[PDB]
Amino acid sequence: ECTKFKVSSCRECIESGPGCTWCQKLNFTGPGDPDSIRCDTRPQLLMRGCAADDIMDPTSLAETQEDHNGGQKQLSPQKVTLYLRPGQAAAFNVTFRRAKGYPIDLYYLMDLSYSMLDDLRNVKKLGGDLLRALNEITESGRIGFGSFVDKTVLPFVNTHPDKLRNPCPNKEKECQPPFAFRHVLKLTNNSNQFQTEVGKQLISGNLDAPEGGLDAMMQVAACPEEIGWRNVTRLLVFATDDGFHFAGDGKLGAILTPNDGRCHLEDNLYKRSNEFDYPSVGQLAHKLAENNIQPIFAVTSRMVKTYEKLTEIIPKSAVGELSEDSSNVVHLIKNAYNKLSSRVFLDHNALPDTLKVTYDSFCSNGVTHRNQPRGDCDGVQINVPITFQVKVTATECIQEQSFVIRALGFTDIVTVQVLPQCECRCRDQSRDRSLCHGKGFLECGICRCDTGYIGKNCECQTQGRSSQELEGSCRKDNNSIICSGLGDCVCGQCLCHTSDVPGKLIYGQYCECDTINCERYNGQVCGGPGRGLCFCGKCRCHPGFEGSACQCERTTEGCLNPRRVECSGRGRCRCNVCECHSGYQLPLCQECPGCPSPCGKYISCAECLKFEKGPFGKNCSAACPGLQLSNNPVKGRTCKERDSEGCWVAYTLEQQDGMDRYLIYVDESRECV
Amino acid sequence: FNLDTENAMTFQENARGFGQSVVQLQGSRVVVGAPQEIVAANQRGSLYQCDYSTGSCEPIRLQVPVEAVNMSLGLSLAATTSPPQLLACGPTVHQTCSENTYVKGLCFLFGSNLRQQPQKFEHEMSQEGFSAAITSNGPLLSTVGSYDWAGGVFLYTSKEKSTFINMTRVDSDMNDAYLGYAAAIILRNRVQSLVLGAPRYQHIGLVAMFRQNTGMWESNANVKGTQIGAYFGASLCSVDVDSNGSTDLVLIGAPHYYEQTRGGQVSVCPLPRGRARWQCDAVLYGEQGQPWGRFGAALTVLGDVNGDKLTDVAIGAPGEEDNRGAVYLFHGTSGSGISPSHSQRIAGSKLSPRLQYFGQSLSGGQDLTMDGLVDLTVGAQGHVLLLRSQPVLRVKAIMEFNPREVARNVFECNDQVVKGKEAGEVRVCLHVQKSTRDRLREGQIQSVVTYDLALDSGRPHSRAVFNETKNSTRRQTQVLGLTQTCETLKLQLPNCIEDPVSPIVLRLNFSLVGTPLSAFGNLRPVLAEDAQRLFTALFPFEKNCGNDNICQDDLSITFSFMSLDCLVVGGPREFNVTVTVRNDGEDSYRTQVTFFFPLDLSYRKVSTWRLACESLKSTSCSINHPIFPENSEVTFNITFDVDSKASLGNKLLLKANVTSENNMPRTNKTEFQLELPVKYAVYMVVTSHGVSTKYLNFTASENTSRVMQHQYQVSNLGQRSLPISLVFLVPVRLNQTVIWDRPQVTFSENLSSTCHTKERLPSHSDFLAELRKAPVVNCSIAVCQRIQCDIPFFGIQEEFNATLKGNLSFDWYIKTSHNHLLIVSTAEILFNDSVFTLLPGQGAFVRSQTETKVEP
Amino acid sequence: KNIENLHGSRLNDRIAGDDQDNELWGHDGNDTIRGRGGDDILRGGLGLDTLYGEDGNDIFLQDDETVSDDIDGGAGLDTVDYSAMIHPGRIVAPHEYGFGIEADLSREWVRKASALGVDYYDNVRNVENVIGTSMKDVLIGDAQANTLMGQGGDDTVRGGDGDDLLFGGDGNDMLYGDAGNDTLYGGLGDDT
Numbered sequence A: 001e002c003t004k005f006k007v008s009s010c011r012e013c014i015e016s017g018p019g020c021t022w023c024q025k026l027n028f029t030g031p032g033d034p035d036s037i038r039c040d041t042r043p044q045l046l047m048r049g050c051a052a053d054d055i056m057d058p059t060s061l062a063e064t065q066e067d068h069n070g071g072q073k074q075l076s077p078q079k080v081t082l083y084l085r086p087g088q089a090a091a092f093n094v095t096f097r098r099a100k101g102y103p104i105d106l107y108y109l110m111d112l113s114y115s116m117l118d119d120l121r122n123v124k125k126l127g128g129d130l131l132r133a134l135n136e137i138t139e140s141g142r143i144g145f146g147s148f149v150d151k152t153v154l155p156f157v158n159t160h161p162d163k164l165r166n167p168c169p170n171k172e173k174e175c176q177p178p179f180a181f182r183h184v185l186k187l188t189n190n191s192n193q194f195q196t197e198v199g200k201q202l203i204s205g206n207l208d209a210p211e212g213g214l215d216a217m218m219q220v221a222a223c224p225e226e227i228g229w230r231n232v233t234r235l236l237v238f239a240t241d242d243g244f245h246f247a248g249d250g251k252l253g254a255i256l257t258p259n260d261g262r263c264h265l266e267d268n269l270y271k272r273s274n275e276f277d278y279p280s281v282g283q284l285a286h287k288l289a290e291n292n293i294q295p296i297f298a299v300t301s302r303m304v305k306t307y308e309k310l311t312e313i314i315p316k317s318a319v320g321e322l323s324e325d326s327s328n329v330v331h332l333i334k335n336a337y338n339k340l341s342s343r344v345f346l347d348h349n350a351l352p353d354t355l356k357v358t359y360d361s362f363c364s365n366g367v368t369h370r371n372q373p374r375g376d377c378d379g380v381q382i383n384v385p386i387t388f389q390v391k392v393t394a395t396e397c398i399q400e401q402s403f404v405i406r407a408l409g410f411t412d413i414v415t416v417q418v419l420p421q422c423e424c425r426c427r428d429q430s431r432d433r434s435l436c437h438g439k440g441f442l443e444c445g446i447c448r449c450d451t452g453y454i455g456k457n458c459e460c461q462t463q464g465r466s467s468q469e470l471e472g473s474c475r476k477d478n479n480s481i482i483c484s485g486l487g488d489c490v491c492g493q494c495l496c497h498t499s500d501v502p503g504k505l506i507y508g509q510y511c512e513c514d515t516i517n518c519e520r521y522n523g524q525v526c527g528g529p530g531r532g533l534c535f536c537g538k539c540r541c542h543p544g545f546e547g548s549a550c551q552c553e554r555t556t557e558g559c560l561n562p563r564r565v566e567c568s569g570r571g572r573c574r575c576n577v578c579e580c581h582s583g584y585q586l587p588l589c590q591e592c593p594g595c596p597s598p599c600g601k602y603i604s605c606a607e608c609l610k611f612e613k614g615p616f617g618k619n620c621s622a623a624c625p626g627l628q629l630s631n632n633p634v635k636g637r638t639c640k641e642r643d644s645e646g647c648w649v650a651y652t653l654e655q656q657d658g659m660d661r662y663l664i665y666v667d668e669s670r671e672c673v
Numbered sequence B: 001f002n003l004d005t006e007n008a009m010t011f012q013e014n015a016r017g018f019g020q021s022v023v024q025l026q027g028s029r030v031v032v033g034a035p036q037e038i039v040a041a042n043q044r045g046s047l048y049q050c051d052y053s054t055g056s057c058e059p060i061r062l063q064v065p066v067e068a069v070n071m072s073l074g075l076s077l078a079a080t081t082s083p084p085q086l087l088a089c090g091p092t093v094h095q096t097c098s099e100n101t102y103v104k105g106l107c108f109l110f111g112s113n114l115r116q117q118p119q120k121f122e123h124e125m126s127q128e129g130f131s132a133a134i135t136s137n138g139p140l141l142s143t144v145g146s147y148d149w150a151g152g153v154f155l156y157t158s159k160e161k162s163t164f165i166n167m168t169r170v171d172s173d174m175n176d177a178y179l180g181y182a183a184a185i186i187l188r189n190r191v192q193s194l195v196l197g198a199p200r201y202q203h204i205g206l207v208a209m210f211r212q213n214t215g216m217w218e219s220n221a222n223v224k225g226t227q228i229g230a231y232f233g234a235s236l237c238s239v240d241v242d243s244n245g246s247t248d249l250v251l252i253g254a255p256h257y258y259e260q261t262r263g264g265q266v267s268v269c270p271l272p273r274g275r276a277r278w279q280c281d282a283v284l285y286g287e288q289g290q291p292w293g294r295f296g297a298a299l300t301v302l303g304d305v306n307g308d309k310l311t312d313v314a315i316g317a318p319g320e321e322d323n324r325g326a327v328y329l330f331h332g333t334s335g336s337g338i339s340p341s342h343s344q345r346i347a348g349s350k351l352s353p354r355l356q357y358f359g360q361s362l363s364g365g366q367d368l369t370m371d372g373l374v375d376l377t378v379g380a381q382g383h384v385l386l387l388r389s390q391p392v393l394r395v396k397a398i399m400e401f402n403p404r405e406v407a408r409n410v411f412e413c414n415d416q417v418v419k420g421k422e423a424g425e426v427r428v429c430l431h432v433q434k435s436t437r438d439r440l441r442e443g444q445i446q447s448v449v450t451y452d453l454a455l456d457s458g459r460p461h462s463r464a465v466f467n468e469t470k471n472s473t474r475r476q477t478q479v480l481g482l483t484q485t486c487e488t489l490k491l492q493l494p495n496c497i498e499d500p501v502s503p504i505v506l507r508l509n510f511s512l513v514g515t516p517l518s519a520f521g522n523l524r525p526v527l528a529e530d531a532q533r534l535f536t537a538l539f540p541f542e543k544n545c546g547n548d549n550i551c552q553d554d555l556s557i558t559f560s561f562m563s564l565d566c567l568v569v570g571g572p573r574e575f576n577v578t579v580t581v582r583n584d585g586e587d588s589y590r591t592q593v594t595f596f597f598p599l600d601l602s603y604r605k606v607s608t609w610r611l612a613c614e615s616l617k618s619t620s621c622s623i624n625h626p627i628f629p630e631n632s633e634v635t636f637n638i639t640f641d642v643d644s645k646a647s648l649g650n651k652l653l654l655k656a657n658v659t660s661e662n663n664m665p666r667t668n669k670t671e672f673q674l675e676l677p678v679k680y681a682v683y684m685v686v687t688s689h690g691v692s693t694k695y696l697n698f699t700a701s702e703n704t705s706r707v708m709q710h711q712y713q714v715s716n717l718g719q720r721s722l723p724i725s726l727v728f729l730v731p732v733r734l735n736q737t738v739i740w741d742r743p744q745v746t747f748s749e750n751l752s753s754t755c756h757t758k759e760r761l762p763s764h765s766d767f768l769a770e771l772r773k774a775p776v777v778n779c780s781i782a783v784c785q786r787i788q789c790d791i792p793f794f795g796i797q798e799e800f801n802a803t804l805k806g807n808l809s810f811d812w813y814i815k816t817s818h819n820h821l822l823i824v825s826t827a828e829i830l831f832n833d834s835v836f837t838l839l840p841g842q843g844a845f846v847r848s849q850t851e852t853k854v855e856p
Numbered sequence C: 001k002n003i004e005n006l007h008g009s010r011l012n013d014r015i016a017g018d019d020q021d022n023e024l025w026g027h028d029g030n031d032t033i034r035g036r037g038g039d040d041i042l043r044g045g046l047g048l049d050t051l052y053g054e055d056g057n058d059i060f061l062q063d064d065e066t067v068s069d070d071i072d073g074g075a076g077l078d079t080v081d082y083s084a085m086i087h088p089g090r091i092v093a094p095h096e097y098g099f100g101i102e103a104d105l106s107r108e109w110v111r112k113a114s115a116l117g118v119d120y121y122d123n124v125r126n127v128e129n130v131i132g133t134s135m136k137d138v139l140i141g142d143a144q145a146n147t148l149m150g151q152g153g154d155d156t157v158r159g160g161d162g163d164d165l166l167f168g169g170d171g172n173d174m175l176y177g178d179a180g181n182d183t184l185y186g187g188l189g190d191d192t
């Protein structure tokens, strides 16, 4: 409701909370009532005679604009403007429609360590196949090539001149000196050029196990015109079989210059690679995100878990299982492209702390996410409109700003511009000045006095002393003192004092209320600022908390097991904690630990359940309260008891939820006399 | 907040790599390494010795062996404060062979004088000395390249004796971990132990702990990182917050942690207790909007800087503001922890535009200015800076009035008197004191202090005005030493006060500026960042409650724990105290009730005219301000919250007394205290267990015996540990025939226990009829041995089995109508009921019985 | 019952006495010791210790360490003894300035150890007498009556205000009586 403290204007009233409204109708406030009685909640004001057409109630609203001349739009709407009131969320829908046939530019990086010899043999006979696979998805496609080994300095590479001449372990055949990054083939749609350029490559070697492919990726992403990128889908296949160096490894080689993230290509070679450190993963992710390049990690079996962690840092990336001879690569690109395209993320650029933004997802598979920090759901299908709900909440009366909501991996953007709604559309151009004694104007139903004149109707002058007659309205009752001793009576209304003690905000009609006199949780009034606020004896909390001191969360309580039942039916949830009855233990009232063995009696049901014995005592119905049977063995109290006839019957008695409700499994083999 | 930034001396040198490594030495000089500077042909690396007295520095002469080509001397440094020692290492020695080239390392140890220095797949690419420390036994050199870059460390006990410390190779998971990239020494009970960091372990990181168990070093704990590529373990720091001689926590930096708005992360890790696991508790962060700032690249101990006897640390962020760099300062807190927010941030851009990578190297814990205050050395690219701590000051102020209260004739309405000629006086005294201890002489520290005086602050019109200014405000500035000064000034009232119920209030608040010290390089003292800056005193009016007497009130306080006998800790979380206050005398002004309770009670609410209450601890409640009238009485309940892990003994006391502004002598009515018993909630269960014998049968024609065991399981499921007693009732004879001979009790947990056996007689003589009703052979119709076993310590959340074993015979069997007899044995747990109690409805599980059926 | 002395554990302890004379030893760890009534001998041992003497004439024995201690003797004439800092064995605390201990009862601290760049202090309140070490020391009194003993070495002693009793001991010592009616003993060696 409307926790208002001190309010004296329509804007001041609305700024005190999202539920406060302002009844403007004249002849509403009695002579003995103050102007703060207007700032109440809507139903209360409508109850006391105010109408629906004379309350102000500024309300946050959103209106969208779309480009009619723009065809084949993939993310709509384009521009949205908001009129935000603090404490009230504006919401609008953003629709994503997957388009068809977007060309592919695939760049290939391969390690040339000595273990990659067979892969090099297979890959250099593969350009036409990969181009054909690209064309089976879109009408136009181009392919490229690259290479990397490691930095040419110890301890990463042996710097002995003989070993720099031939770093391969075997001296028999051809092997090229180590290098950091070489750009081999420009992005082209010709297969013969791919065959000829790659066919000239020779294998290399180094000393360490990890390889410096992050330098190669940063150089690929930082030199757009040399690579040949066009404004289409950009892919980057990373084919390795080991780990990767990252920032900090260069100190072993006495290299402590951080990577600048700028192009350092001369004669298609990454010279100056021995004076810069490896990039950090954050730098690589930021560069790839800003250039819309989507990595595809084609790694061996033992490295899949290692490279899978990168996907939490780098969205729009995929990990594939690469064979030891690299024969399953093209199928890997197909699957990686399917996985990349099937998932959609919705995110916004950086915005200040005064604005909160939340996303809700609805899509084809039926999975719906609510109150998420970013939008995400899989199964995005072609020509299926998938909608996201964006909720924007302002915490203060903000100024004009703008932030962009974007679909990650695409150039299309949604621009959002925000306005405040901290203004009241009051009627003042035709108000009667006579009601203000001519010394003011009726704004929103209240009068504002000119210079010198004071009072609710401007009936007093500040230079004159307050009359003793008006002092009678400044006390609550015959025993209450004027303004409760914490204020001054001037022109018939109390004017409260201030206090040097922090948090001492004196308010109220008679200055009776105070801000620090409420229920205290852990020495803090209302559990501290993070749970609720004090309003002169009553504590009202922020959403998500309840109770006399806001110590109890409202929902999403811990009283529920994964099967979504409160305390397994063995207690009552009271302030996020189950109050178990009988001898059942916290937190979910599951186990009965000191509990007498129940297997003594439940043989009476077990005899008839799986041995076809009929009614003795009674039929096994309206008896056996809450006992059911399980076909498969159920983990629980293993038992063995004497049959009612003489044999040995052993059953395992699992416990389900409820009161005296179990699940039984009776064995069929019996030891008999 | 007390690190100097305007008078920082900068060392500049054109050698390459200058400022990469920095270390303080012997309280007067700082050593700086230049790893990449080319001294001569096939030589790389140089050392410099920079002095604060002169402000310049020259290289330290050192004869490099011819085999140490391109050794990169100065990449790592270490020092010892007492005795003075210096260790310098070059980890990049290019040993060139016929077919290969290897990267080994050398280290040089220096004594007090810098003139003579001793030289210190599998161990080939060792890079020994990459990070190094000095133990009391000798140098400690790490090898990041040992065993396929798994790591390790070499600990030298002599010039030619060393031991290798590393992990255990159960698998290849530790390959390429770079263990020994960072190193530290922990102290406890004057014995040293090692901490080693591996920032590349599984690409996530790892930090290790090593202890010498029976003369051999072994790893006893380790922690791990979370985010890939963050370098968890790339920098280590041991902190002793209380400075008692035992290390409390270890700071671990992850300079390459990635968030959308922050870069860098430092983790606080308290040391494990015994064999407990090592865990992280808090994480420190840099400022917002500084990605790739490399927060946590270098961090060192600064010692106590603010003078609160708690150790403080500094952390470096070389990558901030586009590689300009920054240095953060964190204060230590009680509880072996680090405060989560920084106290100062020094930015390189605010010092000089030429600074780059400011904060890449740090060193602190000594004084180099000879004024007794610790100093911090920060290394940058081509520069080394010296930041100096400053004296910390506090101010205490006191106000007195004379007379203490306004006289009646001053403010009474009168027509034959001169208006505005009232009088008064207020005395104001200020005292400036110093907190930090240092070597500067007395009388050098002077400060300029200005302050405000506000009469009736918070009131539109003040009742009293100063005589000299004729308004409610006054400004004055003056210079203070470390000595109290006093000043007095008259108070005047222009008109009568028609609301004498409110005292006149005086407010004071100040600002302090410290004058520089010319003898110690223009150092300026500063005010404490938490110093109180506002003070208030009250000036009450005289009372005339009746016939111009002194206002004589009579106050009485009583309270009672109504309908409550014992305070059960662990049961109900709150309890009431109904307290009543009476005023038999005339009007009471500013009535105040103060409570006193132990440390495990917290004030929750007050329910009942008006009652405002605020906080062995204490709380103060207000009784109907301003006035509590004549023949008045108030009754109210004060709620308390009792901690579930409270320790109040068996007897808790509450104390309360009443007070008022009239300030009259204390009386027995004014004071009251009452005492309440305490009990502790305990929950523990005893149950029969399945392996206990369920069935036995016999043939009367045969005389074979059998073994019987009744196994009980005892658990302390409660949150308390208490001494307990177990009693087993065992049927032994029936109509003078032995049933269960010489029964014995044995415990599975081999916990301490003592047992004593006693016999009790049956209550029913006619055993035949009793068997005829029910076929139970128990203590009602048989002789029972009562085995009582006493356990002095029954631990929390721990359990054991208690088997009761003995052999049987079947010569006591009665041929009743039923074809069976039951042998029942009961085990029930006792405790001192005067201290411990069971919760309602939970007492049914402290007893159990076990039955064994016998048929022919 | 009927026990006068107590020796603590190697861990943190809280030791309290009675109205009789007690000798309380804390050993290793951080200990809080209260002597209460009578004349007591308090030795905290290693670690950061807080020591109280309350009423009576108490004695505090300090050890060879750099860890600071807080000492409050309360009412009565109280003394602190620093003789165990220098011993024939090996000394852990540094004295690189060669000044033993430095005492200033007016400023309520004792510089128990001192490296070139690090100074270690003790907080001392309501203690009227100090006993030095075998090395040279600096002893400074306060406005009350103090008994200052230098023992061996070339010491300097300043009594401050009041009627003091200053002892020099063996070695060449500098004794200053300052204001009041003082009693000066030089001892062996050439003194002024």
Ligand SMILES: *[C@@H]1O[C@H](CO)[C@@H](O[C@@H]2O[C@H](CO)[C@@H](O)[C@H](O)[C@H]2NC(C)=O)[C@H](O)[C@H]1NC(C)=O
Binding pocket: B146, B147, B150, B151, B164, B166, B167, B168, B169, B174
């Ligand atoms: C830790 O150091 C020990 C030696 O102190 C290493 O043990 C050697 O390991 C190699 C590799 O398998 C074996 O060939 C040697 O026979 C081992 N020697 C001994 C004496 O055990 C051990 O590998 C190191 N652990 C790690 C993780 O590097």
Ligand SMILES: *[C@@H]1O[C@H](CO)[C@@H](O)[C@H](O)[C@H]1NC(C)=O
Binding pocket: A139, A140, A141, A189, A190
């Ligand atoms: C390949 O690219 C060239 C360059 O423009 C173009 O002329 C040709 O049509 C392209 N071929 C295919 C099949 O797209």
Ligand SMILES: *[C@@H]1O[C@H](CO)[C@@H](O)[C@H](O)[C@H]1NC(C)=O
Binding pocket: A230, A231
């Ligand atoms: C592609 O987009 C970039 C965006 O900066 C633009 O400059 C360029 O003109 C576009 N077209 C081509 C062919 O690069």
Ligand SMILES: *[C@@H]1O[C@H](CO)[C@@H](O)[C@H](O)[C@H]1NC(C)=O
Binding pocket: A159, B042, B043, B069, B070, B094, B096
């Ligand atoms: C040592 O460094 C110099 C620097 O130019 C270089 O020329 C020389 O080859 C290096 N020595 C070895 C053995 O690599």
Ligand SMILES: *[C@@H]1O[C@H](CO)[C@@H](O)[C@H](O)[C@H]1NC(C)=O
Binding pocket: B450, B451, B452, B509, B510, B511
């Ligand atoms: C005292 O506080 C006021 C504001 O509350 C401030 O304007 C004034 O400067 C302060 N006094 C001094 C001496 O700074």
Ligand SMILES: *[C@@H]1O[C@H](CO)[C@@H](O)[C@H](O)[C@H]1NC(C)=O
Binding pocket: B469, B470, B471, B472, B473
């Ligand atoms: C009070 O008088 C002094 C001195 O005349 C003056 O500096 C100050 O501004 C005055 N204050 C007000 C509020 O007028």
Ligand SMILES: *[C@@H]1O[C@H](CO)[C@@H](O)[C@H](O)[C@H]1NC(C)=O
Binding pocket: B574, B575, B576, B578, B637, B639
């Ligand atoms: C006892 O305290 C509770 C607070 O939990 C309060 O609600 C109740 O009114 C009190 N009862 C009495 C008799 O004071």
Ligand SMILES: *[C@@H]1O[C@H](CO)[C@@H](O)[C@H](O)[C@H]1NC(C)=O
Binding pocket: B594, B596, B656, B657, B658, B659, B666, B670
């Ligand atoms: C109330 O009791 C406390 C107990 O510590 C005492 O300090 C205080 O002076 C007492 N006040 C009155 C008015 O009796």
Ligand SMILES: *[C@@H]1O[C@H](CO)[C@@H](O)[C@H](O)[C@H]1NC(C)=O
Binding pocket: A673, B697, B698, B699, B856
């Ligand atoms: C005793 O019990 C065993 C167990 O089955 C059985 O084989 C035996 O026949 C029984 N003896 C008598 C005398 O009933």
Ligand SMILES: *[C@@H]1O[C@H](CO)[C@@H](O)[C@H](O)[C@H]1NC(C)=O
Binding pocket: B704, B705, B706, B707, B807, B808
């Ligand atoms: C108990 O009886 C069993 C079987 O009759 C026998 O094996 C065992 O030795 C006996 N033990 C004792 C202590 O009599």
Ligand SMILES: *[C@@H]1O[C@H](CO)[C@@H](O)[C@H](O)[C@H]1NC(C)=O
Binding pocket: B774, B775, B776, B777, B778, B779, B780
């Ligand atoms: C013993 O057995 C009898 C017969 O069933 C039963 O009534 C009684 O409760 C049992 N316990 C005791 C202590 O007598």
Ligand SMILES: *[C@@H]1O[C@H](CO)[C@@H](O)[C@H](O)[C@H]1NC(C)=O
Binding pocket: B691, B713, B748, B799, B800, B801
């Ligand atoms: C008691 O015996 C059972 C036998 O099944 C065993 O599982 C359990 O661990 C024992 N209790 C304890 C505390 O070891």
Ligand SMILES: [Ca+2]
Binding pocket: A115, A116, A117, A118, A119, A324, A325
């Ligand atoms: Ca391969």
Ligand SMILES: [Ca+2]
Binding pocket: B240, B241, B242, B243, B244, B245, B246, B247, B248
């Ligand atoms: Ca410690």
Ligand SMILES: [Ca+2]
Binding pocket: B303, B304, B305, B306, B307, B308, B309, B310, B311, B312, B331, B332
């Ligand atoms: Ca501190």
Ligand SMILES: [Ca+2]
Binding pocket: B367, B368, B369, B370, B371, B372, B373, B374, B375, B388, B389
């Ligand atoms: Ca200094």
